[PDB]
Paper text:
The BuV1 VP2 sequence and structure as well as capsid structure was compared to other protoparvoviruses with available 3D structures. This deletion removed the residues closest to the three-fold axes, resulting in three separate protrusions (also in BuV2 and BuV3) compared to the other protoparvoviruses that have a single pinwheel protrusion centered at this axis. At the 2-fold region, the depression was conserved while VR-IX adopted a different conformation; on the 2-fold wall, VR-VI was larger in BuV1 due to an 8-residue insertion. The melting temperature (Tms) of the BuV capsids determined by DSF were 64.9 ± 0.2 °C for BuV1, 77.3 ± 0.3 °C for BuV2, and 73.4 ± 0.2 °C for BuV3. Consistent with this observation, despite the higher (~10%) BuV1 VP2 sequence identity to the protoparvoviruses, the three separated protrusion 3-fold morphology of the BuVs resembled the human infecting viruses rather than the single pinwheel of the protoparvoviruses.
The BuVs, along with CuV and TuV belong to the genus Protoparvovirus, which prior the BuV discovery contained only animal (non-human) infecting viruses, and are classified as novel Primate protoparvovirus 1 species.
Numbering used by the authors:
A (entry chain Q): 82 to 325
B (entry chain E), E (entry chain P): 33 to 569
C (entry chain F): 326 to 472
D (entry chain Q): 375 to 521
Write the structure that this text describes.
Amino acid sequence: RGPRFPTDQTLQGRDTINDSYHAQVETPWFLINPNSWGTWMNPADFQQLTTTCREVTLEHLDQTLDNIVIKTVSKQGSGAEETTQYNNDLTALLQVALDKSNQLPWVADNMYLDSLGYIPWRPCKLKQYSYHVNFWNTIDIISGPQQNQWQQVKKEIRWDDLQFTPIETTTEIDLLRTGDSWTSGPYKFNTKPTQLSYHWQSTRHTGSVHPTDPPNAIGQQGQNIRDINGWQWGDRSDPMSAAT
Amino acid sequence: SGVGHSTGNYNNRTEFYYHGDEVTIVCHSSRHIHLNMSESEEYKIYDTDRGPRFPTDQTLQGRDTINDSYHAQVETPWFLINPNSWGTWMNPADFQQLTTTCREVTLEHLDQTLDNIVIKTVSKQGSGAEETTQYNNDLTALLQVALDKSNQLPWVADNMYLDSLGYIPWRPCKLKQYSYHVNFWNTIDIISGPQQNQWQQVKKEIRWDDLQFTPIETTTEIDLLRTGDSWTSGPYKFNTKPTQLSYHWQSTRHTGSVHPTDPPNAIGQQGQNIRDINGWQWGDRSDPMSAATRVSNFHIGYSWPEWRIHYGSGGPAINPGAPFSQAPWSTDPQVRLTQGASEKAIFDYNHGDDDPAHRDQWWQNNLPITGQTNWAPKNAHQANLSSNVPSRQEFWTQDYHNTFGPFTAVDDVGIQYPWGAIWTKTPDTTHKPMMSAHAPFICKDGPPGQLLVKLAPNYTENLQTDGLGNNRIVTYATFWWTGKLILKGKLRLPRQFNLYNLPGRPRGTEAKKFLPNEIGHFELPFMPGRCMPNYTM
Amino acid sequence: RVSNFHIGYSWPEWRIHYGSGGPAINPGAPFSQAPWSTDPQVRLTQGASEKAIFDYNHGDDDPAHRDQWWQNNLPITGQTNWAPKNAHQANLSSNVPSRQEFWTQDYHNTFGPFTAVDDVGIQYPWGAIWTKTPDTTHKPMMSAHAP
Amino acid sequence: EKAIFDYNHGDDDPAHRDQWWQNNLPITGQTNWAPKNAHQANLSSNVPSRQEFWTQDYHNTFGPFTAVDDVGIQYPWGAIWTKTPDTTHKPMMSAHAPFICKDGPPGQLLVKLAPNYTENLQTDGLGNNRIVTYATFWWTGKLILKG
Amino acid sequence: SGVGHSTGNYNNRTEFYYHGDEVTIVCHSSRHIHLNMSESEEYKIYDTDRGPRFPTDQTLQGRDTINDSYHAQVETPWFLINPNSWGTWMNPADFQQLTTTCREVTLEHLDQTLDNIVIKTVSKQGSGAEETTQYNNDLTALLQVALDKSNQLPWVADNMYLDSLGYIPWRPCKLKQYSYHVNFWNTIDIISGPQQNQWQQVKKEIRWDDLQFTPIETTTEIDLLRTGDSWTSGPYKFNTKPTQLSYHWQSTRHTGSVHPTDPPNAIGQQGQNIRDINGWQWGDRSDPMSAATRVSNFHIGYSWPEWRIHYGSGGPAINPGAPFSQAPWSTDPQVRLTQGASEKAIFDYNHGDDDPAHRDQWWQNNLPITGQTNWAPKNAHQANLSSNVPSRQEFWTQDYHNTFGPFTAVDDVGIQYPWGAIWTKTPDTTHKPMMSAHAPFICKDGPPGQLLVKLAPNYTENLQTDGLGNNRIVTYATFWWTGKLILKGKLRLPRQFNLYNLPGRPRGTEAKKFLPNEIGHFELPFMPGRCMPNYTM
């Protein structure tokens, strides 16, 4: 179920918001995704972006893999000495799958922050690809007399309706020796821009301004005009006000 | 062409055309229509009794008022032919072939004809104890046909009350009389009285001073057909968006990245959720990293005050909410949970009931669709989402709020094979609706057709004599309707390794139903039309 | 009867926003109260009615006095949904539910993907012709006043 | 939203995870706290009574008249793009990722290290099937932006 | 190209192409093959023990002799790669899409390659208590590949004993050693002894004076491959006739014109056969006109001495008879009726068993195929067919005769998805066989391929030293096999009004099987391959 999920009704179902229960299929594949800001830009270059740009779009993406190095560790000795030796296997393969057709479950976003590291000179370590299969976790927090009890209605993995897609049958896989490299080819986005500025106006800041005569000196406050001719909502006459 | 030449052939079958990803479905249909002399030759405007089961007393304190049939209508002396339904066009085997091999489908265009007009006049003979009837065909009698391609008439053509051409090809079809609403005020107050336990009729009337009455004659041009004549509608081209033929099982808990888990070691063990992980959350969340509080980009499904009764002007109505299955919350079978915006189809002998003078039922509860399922009572909200768990205060279990918003993704019901309507009229308003509660296809331009036929009157020797007499000669007609609408699908290919579970008859049903009986009585099977799982995202 | 769409929507009518910058008001959909009007004496504002004060140059006859109008949108009906009048049930079945399972006065927002609604339209003497489109993600669908 | 993060993702201390919790302080005027709001039966020159005034409803007031903003881009930890769920009525805007992909999202690149088996295969018997192996390779990419 | 460049990509998937009635199935497949140093480097000719369960005594009086494994073979030091099976080529979902949308299918042509050769040599280190092993790859070592396109070698490549590439794509495949029979005489007399209750070995020997021994080296040209090298077979084009993907339910009682019947009146009644009708019959038939004795043009199915044991030269064998279902005669489930020429498939972990070190079973009994069903004991014959009924004499119940003749129509088993062989060698004889008992496709010309690979030997410093030493260096290889065979199908369209019952998992099975486990173990489902009813005529 997860960490902090209730075993008892003392907190009467409010702990059930902590629920990690899921059913998954884990492939033996590792995911490379550059989906994050800061994989792409360092702080100074995001600042230059953010000051000089009113809004921004994604144009297109391109990515490669190269300089493959595959080694095999070989233990040596009696185990008290435990000498390890690192030999590179020149004929070993690294195999690369990219689905341009999006036939696989997508599951690639930063939630749990599985992404390439932000600072350029550290090594990055991949996380294993996996995706959900259908399951029923339904939990009743209204259960019991007085409706203070929580209960598991139906918790199961649904097998009769399930869909399992391997990487091998879905897409074509490239096999790479050491001297080989891989390029994805161009990918063109189509999306709408995002505003880089924030809006401070509510509906009280937006429209025409309530008639006010100005203050006379530095101490005084503006003075709202009592009788004005504008529109209102309900029957409003005497109380003309910017709220209504 | 003449009296002794048949004007058109009978073709009822569909054939499929597969090229690449495109699949073209051309489904022909032909019907033998029985037409009776119109009941009265004049337009009538009247209102109705309240209805069956409406309360006369406050014992049930207004809850019965959900049964309200009261309306005011104008009935024209015209009969409506509409082919708006699935199963007018396709038999079960050909809808199965559609549903297995197509990922999604559109309406391409529609065409329809009328021909082989036969008009007869019944003539009584004898003293009434013998009562010999004679059927003579009047070669010069007329059948008159109105089709509005301009949609100037009130539309009122959809399967609700299931006025549509019969589903099985070899039975005769019988038309229903065209009529439409006029404005009236039905408003009912269920809050009335002290303690607000009383229901009261606020204002129930037909509004005359503002009313609009449009006859068929002044609206459109009418074709008059003798026996040797035929009629063709000409082509009608749809413009609408496709409908998905697959159902989505993913909720927002199935959709995104998966909570980090280390695998189990052997066949008995369970996966183990990692305690300390670095992901995003919503409120202040640190120690309790959990898939429930994982931030996601979208949300799937929305809550609603399920079975909302509108009580607008014109009567109590019902505001649907989103379709979903109650199967996850189903528990015991005995009780029937309707709250998933389920629909129920009554139907008759010609519409796929086996027994004459009885009406079989179905009630699709949309069992395949899950992950869109939101039962309003089950939900909750908190004041703050933090590492701490709130108190008894700050937590509210039974609100029933509408949670539809800018972040939600939902599904329409889809096509419901035997009884479901194919298309619909788009109401002309600011902000047209986003999606339809029933009919899968919205017509961006006007909907097709709305074909109307009336049997022109045959008057006796003397006219407007009245005096406990009958004005005109008893007459009826039989003619043949043929039409084809073309569909464009997109080929469905396997997206998974394991076997799909392919379309077929409903689970509880056997195959002795759906097949003709010793008398020839059989039922058509319900087909989901959204038939297979697919990844939402 | 099942229908493909629904016309009009409920709202917590005369919602006061209390956002940053002050209490404001969140309109709801325009409709007539004439079906629920009953006696004339009482004035039912709940149809998202609007009132126009105006001055001599703007079409008042008397100088140094301000005439009023208050359009209540009497012609528009069938979009009319008074929130209190509505109800919801637990189940819709051949049986009629009990005193429990039936809730009369919720005041919920029933706007959704199935609803069709109308803007007020042009209001001749005092109504504004056009408006600025606020630049935000998801521009508004329709305007509460300007046509 | 709150972002936990690790050493490679911009935490300074190894074996510990720093936190942030963006509360979106700059964005105001969109601020609506549900409890603070209210609704009245009638809006008139008169002020309603204790009845007709309801303070704590918690209703959804999203409707055809509302304009709102997405969060925007959140630099270190925020995701750039997202998959559009294929459903009737695609969502209007995203709760987190600033960019929605109208067509399919890019990529989803997967790599596996092909297995190196020892002399004998499927021997089992408390043995290991394959040779211990690891790889290091270089990923390079460029995405272009238009501002 | 070189040491550090991969020679070919991994592609395992199938894609379908629909144009008109034609559907093109291109099914790619790719495997990772583990190859061990050949056991001995020389050709060996030897015979074997009789077998497991063969009788040493006459207690069961010869009936055990049906268990006979005795044979004489020549084992080459070569390993066989054959992709002859369904399920090497297709996963369950893609065989389902084939089987639903195709009426019949042919083999178009085959192509296959080998690449990414990796050869390593294991080197022991230490005293043997530590026993440190080291795996070094020999860059100059050779892997040698023989393919006979001329079919000069004994064919011996089919799934019986299921020597074939594994069905699921991501597991490694392990080859079996190539060998073939040499002539021997196994003849066994089960009639021996007084009272003929004794079994005796007549002559059991390997015949040397007439024998033919063909090595791989002198027969065909051999390619030698280093690491950077690859190998392609070139195209191979099949010529064979199609196989039906639908099953026939009609017997000769279902086939023809129907006996005259007047209909029933109501839902309870039975049809009523007309007493006096004018049709054809067989013998003198007049008063007893009956559908049993109706003359027909053909007969469907034939009797056989079911489970005939041949006892030819070379051993007891079994002569199949025609495939059919025992379901009509099934009665109680407990007893298992094998007589329909049923087949049983044992299989292993890589071939679709879930549990390692255990072998799951299937036993297809061909339940869908009926109307071809003839159980020999049930039949009878009479002296005369007349209006009279014969006596106790003239009627013979239990003959067991072969009734195959010029008038009979029969069906082959068809394709059996997971374990069934795709094609077969045509034996070259006068009068080639008419149809095959197992493999759906007969190769009119030579069958494809029969690809053989051996790992060339790595000898130590000293050669032919013997003296309780090992001659050569321990070595093994891993390489990648890829191939595609193309199919031509014919589109399947609905021939009926009612819903078909579409392909899917077997009836008794659930869907938790056929899906990966917590460990990753799963079974592939049996698919009938003749999946749907069709009118025989």
